[model samples]
Target chain A: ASSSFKAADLQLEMTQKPHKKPGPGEPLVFGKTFTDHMLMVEWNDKGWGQPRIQPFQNLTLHPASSSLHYSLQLFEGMKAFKGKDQQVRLFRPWLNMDRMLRSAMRLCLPSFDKLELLECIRRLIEVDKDWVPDAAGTSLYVRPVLIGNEPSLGVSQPRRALLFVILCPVGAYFPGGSVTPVSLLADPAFIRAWVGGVGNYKLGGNYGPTVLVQQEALKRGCEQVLWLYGPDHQLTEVGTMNIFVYWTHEDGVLELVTPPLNGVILPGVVRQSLLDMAQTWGEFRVVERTITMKQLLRALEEGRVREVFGSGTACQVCPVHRILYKDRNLHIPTMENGPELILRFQKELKEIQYGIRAHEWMFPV
Target chain B: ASSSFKAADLQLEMTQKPHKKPGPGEPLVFGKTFTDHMLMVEWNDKGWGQPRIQPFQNLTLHPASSSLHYSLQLFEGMKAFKGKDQQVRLFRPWLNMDRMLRSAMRLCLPSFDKLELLECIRRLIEVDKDWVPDAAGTSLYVRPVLIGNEPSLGVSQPRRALLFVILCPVGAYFPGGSVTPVSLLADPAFIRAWVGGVGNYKLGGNYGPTVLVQQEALKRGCEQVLWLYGPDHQLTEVGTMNIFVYWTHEDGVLELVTPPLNGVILPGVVRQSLLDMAQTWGEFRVVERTITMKQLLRALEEGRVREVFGSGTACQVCPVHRILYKDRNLHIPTMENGPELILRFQKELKEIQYGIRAHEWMFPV
Candidate 1:
């Protein structure tokens, strides 16, 4: 039962009239500008169809497509950087593929071989390699999306699905290539994930609902949302990224901690990278466990909290300088402390990404 | 601010080549076959554009539409019936409009005048009036979907959106027009909704995640999922509908109960109608409160449990005969009790729907 497509069966149809690339120094919004080509694959009950690399185009979907009615969709965000040597390399894309497959299974969408899909994506990037910006802190953002396109509105497993990959030339997440600390609104009134939910997966459902809450955060004069869960107010995530706390423990030891993958937090690739890097250095104890807001507040009051930041593909590492919680502004001294550890982690990851430091994690195209 | 569209600006574009109508006694799946025309409206930051009743066709969306990658979508399930008087009528459509508006606000989508949208829907139905089935237990299912179609994928409020309505002539939810009792798998391993979540709204995100869980239930030999929440295992929903229990309380009084409109429960139209009908009858106690699995098991052990059912637009009343809970099958005496309450509620609702009862709830089209 060969239920998935093979990369060997890929068909290429390059565009005759390729769009002009963005000029140098042009401000590139996160996902506003796409490359000239895209990779697409279709799936049905009979199994997956031929994979294709074709011109970027709009999708023609049936009015009754299940994805439009039931949100039967999932996506992954990754990036490919153009090194100084003119080589394009994806940063740990295997992790994104693994999570994408998990998300497909969670949504009951058709599954495919991760390696085959990755190979197809590699080909896609190679075809559009020129779109990868060579400027500092600029990369081609890779977005892989899977959607149930069955032309029926029944709330069941989709008989038809589509997997597509699109590339966007994105500038640095922070304007001017400077790391600006973000203020967060930690409101207990809004819960992001539950213990027995799909928060561990990067399903489209998880992201859409948070937009309104994010707007609320902005209205409260904060830059992002600090999602809290349960009566004890366990900090789960910050915006769409994984939250980390660098603080001194009650046992008199400095520690770096992020919420464990306890079915209520996304297993971010950057989050794992930071943990691995810290553990390799053997600098401070890197722990993955629950961190409550009360405990964080107490540590801040005791002058024991050092730095708080978020880890994700969009922003490699975003510092947190303030939190509006319980009708009070809690100043997080991440900037006051110089954010030395944050900058170091960012620099190390950037070095690996741009070929300044050779690392096996970079998959060269 | 003139942010919403008005029905006065609606334009009609009749279809030239209409497809053949389904033959008499032809089997119709829930949402497979659509009518000749559809209603469409577009919106952007500048506000809503023209409304049109155009020929049914596929939608052309950008590859980076937020609805595809972030699930920025919501939908409503409603029905229109061909009464014995040869008149078409909608059942409490204003409620669906209100819920849809609430869902849009919750997802940060644009808002529209409910009455105007309803007017547009009414006009669309008028244009396809012949599609409404005249058969018993059959009706036209009206699905109105709102999706964020912005070309960018920045994970913020969509600047562009599409609101459209499609009509499908559907057969009875249960084949053969017979009321069959369903078996539900009540495993606390899966949680449907939690406080502060968007379960109370009819968002696409809420439905997509449940398909996998529903498949799990089918694998466990159950027809639907008896969604439980919290440590005490509070029963929240059954499949895509609201759950109801008819039983004798510890005080020896007959009571019909469903979960309250707490944040964890969907404010279902059928659920609300059932409560209103039962309250109007002034027969037994109709309670809206929490019902835990432990309390239900105790009631069943005491021979106080009578009937259990699910209420939704698809199936007016679907009785539950057994619950697979805690790795054991608990038989519900709904059939043994003749499902009197369930049948009565269904008959009454059907009467109103078909215009036999001449109720004000049915709006003539």
Candidate 2:
């Protein structure tokens, strides 16, 4: 994966598409807007073919394109950070590409020419460098989507596919520069993915029918929804992110327990990175396994729960204040810095990300 | 729903694209190819508007189109039967429209004026009327697709959506004019939809990722996959289609059972039509509910399973002759006339489709 990113020999196409620049009031909300150029490459059963970095263009597809008919689509949600050093750096981008490859395989989408696609993306970023915001907490969010476009109606392996990238310079994730702790509802009525299910794949199908349930959370005064499974309602994920709970095991072990890398959970890079760093802190056990709702509720009730949050590529580590059950709210205990793990994890890791604390994870571009 | 089929009122626009007039060598395989004209319409939160019947054209969508990023898309599959009387008739056309609406609503997709879209379909068929095959079993398959075109990346409901329909002059489903029996693989490794999930919705996400498993079925020597649910592994569906079984109960009563509309199966038009036509024949009971795999296997083992076949608009009755299971072949008796009820259902429906039988179910053009 690392080797695929560094080769610099690539064609340069300077086509331009007319785009409406954003107004001052918009803050350039990510995923809600786009850059002036999009990079695309077509792949089919034959093999990877031509690569192009064209002006942001509309995707022309067969009405029976598998991507539109079947959710034969996978994507990566990563950002290009305009660093304090004035260098445009992707936040561990190869990790996103690696995940995309695995996800594409899961969907059996045509194999991508990753190296060329990566070069095409870099050129796109270079051409649209002016579109990158200068403000703090603002960066260009990049989405690389691969979809099957075979016109056949059969439910067999597609003969054609497309890989394209679009950029959206996003404003602050938390508009106030601080997170208003979120409350989530855990409902087994809807299970995101199960064992042997494609829940682990970051495909479009994973997100399509889920917004409805997330809306349900908002109706119940919650900001997120926690997906649980099994008879005991084993916790799996929080909305689109992975669940990270800061708690004290009754076994007297201080730990940060999150769902594991089992097929039931998405293999999130940030989620794993946080765990890797948090464990090195040696203050708490960074545990990964099936965590039932009962265990968490018991910990909260017995005052063993310190903090609970969600971890994903988008938000990194978002703290959770309370869980909105069907009829009640389960609150977590907090002190000066709030939940110990979430507080320290957010501060130090964010410090490393912003280059305040130099770490090997920081790759200067 | 029945009154909306005033296709004569729709305005038509012809395209300059070259046409392919089929000859003896080209069989009208279902969705692999298309005609020279297509139908398109635009729908928003407001309502449906005038439908456009234009020359067949490729759709160019923005890279950030909601249909590409999020799975905010839905579609309908129905065919127009060119009857022996040289008349064009749609098979349960209203049913497809109703389901499309239901799917659009569930996915928070923008609402549209479907009435106009249906009219547009009619106009396209008329313009390409000669494209309709005159053979014994040929028809023009119509594919109506609705996709979110909102350029914004917001994951919520798409504010803008497009509704497009394409008519593919298709040959008879079985080109040889003979019934072909299919085999089933009953491995529950793949679950199509869950109880509270959007299994009932026609969102592309529902069917897109399931094709790989369908391919797995072919390698295992099975022609179709039978979806089973729960620990009991009740029969749910077949490859992008619904399933029905015919058997004689110990009480000497002939029973036809299909998966119920319990929110876990697609409410297919043919499935419902069969349920509606249950009492057409004497001493036969039509039960629409779960039929566990164990019970079906036992019936097959005892040679009491008269016939088991798949039913959907894509293919009226795909007969099941054998099932590959647990390192052995479990053959379902599709002997003689190929599952007696399916034989009758196929003929009765085909006759009605070709204007040979007069039934209220027929939606004549």
Candidate 3:
């Protein structure tokens, strides 16, 4: 698999003219608009095929495609930020590509060299670099998807696949707004991931099964679903993000705890970066361990729960101030400015992403 | 929502001339070849769009389609058998459409009148009536799919969707004229569905995640997977079908048992038919309740295990002779002519499907 293929092998094909116009001058909605060009690569029984970056357009696929029938698809969420210095920079993009490659393997699709896929992405980003937003907290959201394209009526490993990338110019996650604390619905009945399921992977199967559960949360006036699993009701994740809780332990030591990589929780990039940065601070006990709903409820009852938030690429940190559990709405205390560490992680990550901090994690296209 | 649409509203625009040739005939494989015409209907925020019966072809969709990105899709499997009288008949098609409607609602896609969708399917099948195979154990398999087509990056309900029906001529699942008993890999470590998941639904998300686990079974020289759940290790399903076990109880009573339709087991159509038919036989105790792996192992040890089989739309009834679990191969004993009841159910269902018996379940199309 290591000797499979390279991205430099792409034969560039241009449309001569741009098909999509620039985004509206104002802040754009998430994932609604797209750049003028896209990148696509195919794979079959032999191996990967020549990659191409051409004009963005609709894909014509057999209706019986396995990706459509069996959910044999996976994707990555990355962003291209226009730094304060007027250069297009990707924040830890290799991380997204790495995760995408892993998801590909799990989805029974062909794998490619991470750097090669990144190279293919780099060229596509270069051609659409102007589409990257220049404003603070606004960046070009990039979605790289791999799908099983084999057209058959049976459920099995795909014999063909397509890897494609598209760019969507968007504003801040909370556009024209501040970092308002969000509320979550913690219901044990709508568990997301389990011990033997594909919850840790960024596969299409994981997300589609979540929309209705999210709707249940919405019906109860919650912004996201706090996915809990097992009889102990272990906190797994929040909708589309990794959840974290800050509290003062019974021993009077402050600690930050998130669910461990127990084969169920997604090893999110933002979740990892926050842990790394927090461990460097050494100001508190940083832990990656299971925290049950009972433990959280007890902490809330004791007023030991300091703050709660979710981490992801879309919004580096989402402050969570309320949780509705079993007919009770637990109001988590948060200052008007938000939790100290949550804000710190958000600011530091964004600063590095905007190239304000000379961090090596940023990659220029 | 009920007052919004009707199947009679569909507009028919065919290929006018013959767009596809006749079947290649010797014996078609499952899901490989397809019939000429297909049925399609779209839904948007407003309501369901007009339905159409057009030539089978490719579909053009946005790259960010949620069907590909988030697995917002569901499907139903039904068949149209060419009766001995050369008339096409659909066996209990309403069961499939009903389950599909429920799946669509769970996927957050728009719902339509089941009768309306059935009418759409009937028309498509009629247009391609000649494609149905008249040979024994062969039929035109129908796949009805519903997908969230909205192109977006967030994990929310789709704003657009498409419902389609396609046909394929398939030969007998067990070739060479024998009811072959399969071997299963029964490992509790890898599970197919969870209690709170959409396991009981025909969602695409449910199938894709099981492919890798099924491959593991294949590697172990097993033809299918016997999915177990919970601390008790209750048998939930077998591969894509519902599993049944026949045994002689300690009281000297013969019993037929299958896992109950809890939240985890898919309520298969064939499984339902077998259950209904068995209840009418009234020669043994037909049960739908929890059956643990321990109980089955204990039964095997006592030499009381008579027969085991799986029920699904694809194969109707597939027998099981051995189960590999925890490095132990548990063998089940069946007569040289196979279990009497197993053969009875298969013959009965096929007679009803092929119109050999005058049954109300068969719908003339």
Candidate 4:
């Protein structure tokens, strides 16, 4: 007996008439518009069911579904880029698959073969290949969501689950196609991820509570939140992305530092890629360890801070220019220093994403 | 111009053919079965729309609904009891409405008048009066869920939302008509709510992550998790309910203690009711303060521990008999002491719920 369904059992149902795609010059909002096709797989206590690729439609869910009641849901974010050679490629999607699988386990949702799910996603992308935008700074955003859909109110393991993938053609994070450093609100009052919490996972629970704090950030004249943790106010994450800082250490050595994966920080794919690339360069000390706001403030005071940025799939690398902490504005010289490192990282990552450079990270469709 | 809609604008759409009600002797699962009718109301950036009481049905949601993808949802747990006089009554639902409003604000979801929402719930109960079980210790469990239904993936304030109420007729928690004390697993590794988190709110995010921990407790041969917080391992909650400890303090004063509402503890209605009732009795020192695991263990060893129970709308009062901690099973003397305090609280609350005694807490539908 099969414990879980395989991708070989995937069934496809194409739409009679495909939906219209966005025009070339039309402005694209991040996730407002979506592709025509979607991939869905159902799982019950017995085992996983057949995977299906069908036209995108609204989901009919029991009002008592656990996902809606208890937030037993998780998601992954990835992108498919259409290269100049007319080839569509996904950047290190296996990492996403791995994270998705881990997130599923964390939520006690059913586990499936990551490769099988990846294959299903690849097939869905193939069916809607035309949806992959070709312009620079534009790509097809892939969102894989796993939710417990058990129709019961008991706060226990879900007996039924649903995994679905949707695609959206997103434009540049910087609308004008020019990188702009964002100011941040670094308040210890609103902590994001904490020790012994689910902040490391891409669970829906981790994201929902931040909206109010994000609004507060906006109201405070900050573009994003510099999430702090612990009594000492250790820097954890920046908004939904992982935080990174480049500065001269007290030992007088230049280094790239991010919060260590000590159970509080999300292990972002882009964050890993940057660390890998920087370490390969061996030009600076790339260290993953605890970085406190006090340390950062001291560095800023001593004029040792160079640049600060956030890493994620949505915004590959977003530079930080200022931080509002404890009624004081700390100006970071990221742009002043040309944000040289991040720009280089972004360019190199894009090169591989668009097939401008050959790299093992890209998987062709 | 009108802003939030009112309960006066509620519309009724009855089903053409009602579903069969469960037999008097039928076994009723907590939330596995629902009533024939449901209450639904839609909200947008403009304001709330007209409320509707319609036939029970599944909700049609976009695949990218925030409720599913980002967990932008919250809910309230309440009960409707059928008194011996054949009248349906609801416990202090106004508290639930107030908490629900706070949860919505915490999630950045839209807010409405608490009284208006309570009125809408009253009408819903009136429509589903037959679903209220008349058996002793049985009542109709009312679940009111509010979800962000925006069909976009942006992590911001939800522009669209859905609020719906469903009723489930639940049997006696102690099916055998005898309250059996439950064993608890007290571990510091699994933290429920933190100081700066949304644990105080009744958000979906707060409940989802606990299922896995709850399973861990079950695997460890414990019926519930004695959620601890901070380094000293202060007791916060037990399972999904507020925890209470009846012990003779080291100061030689008999006291009833539970964790304080210090941003991390949920302000449970039943917890407040018990405190209020106990304070009115004025027989013991009722103090809301932190009680660490060390203190509890020392108390247990010193033989000062009298009874330990959990308070919630579902359980009313659930006694704890033992705790598994640090490879040691600390036997609690709750049952040995006859759990007199919890039994008294349960009976008094039931009297008000079933209209055996007239009280302001009970609202007749």
lDDT of 2 by residue, B286-333 (tens): 787678878877777666778878888767888888877666787667
Local error of candidate 2 at residue A126 (angstroms): 3.2
TM-score for model 3?
A: 0.96
DockQ winner between 1 and 4, please give it. Answer: 4
lDDT of 2 by residue, A1-365 (tens): 22222234334566555577665546565577777777777766546656667777678888778888887888888777666666676666667777888887777776554655565677788778767765656677788989988887766678888888888877767774666567888777877876667888888887878778878888888888889887888888898788887777879897888878788788887887888888787866888877988888778777787777788756777877777665777775553346666667767766666666666765444
**Per-residue lDDT over B1-365 for candidate 1, one digit per residue giving the tens place of the 0 to 100 score:** 35678776467889998978887658798888989999899998678998899999999999999999899999999999998899999999999999999999999899899988998999999999999998888899999999999999799999999999999998877666568999999999987778889999888988888998898889999999999998889999898889999999889999999999898888999999999999999999999989999999999999999999999999889999999998999999999999999989988998899988888898888
TM-score of chain B of each: 0.97, 0.92, 0.95, 0.98
Clashing pairs in model 1, backbone N/Cα/C closer than 3 A = none
- DockQ measured for candidate 4: 0.90
Stretches of candidate 3 exceeding 4 Å from the true structure: A1-5, A15-25, A336-338, B1-5, B9-25, B335-337
Local accuracy of candidate 4 as per-residue lDDT tens digits, B33-84? 8898998999996679898999999999999999998899999999989988
lDDT of 4: 0.90
lDDT values for all models: 0.91, 0.76, 0.85, 0.90
Ten contiguous residues minimizing lDDT sum, candidate 1 chain B: B1-10
The clash tally of candidate 3 reads 0
- DockQ for all models, in order? 0.89, 0.66, 0.84, 0.90
Identify the runs in model 1 with alpha carbons over 4 angstroms from their true place. Answer: A1-3, B175-178
For candidate 2, the per-residue lDDT at A328 reads 73
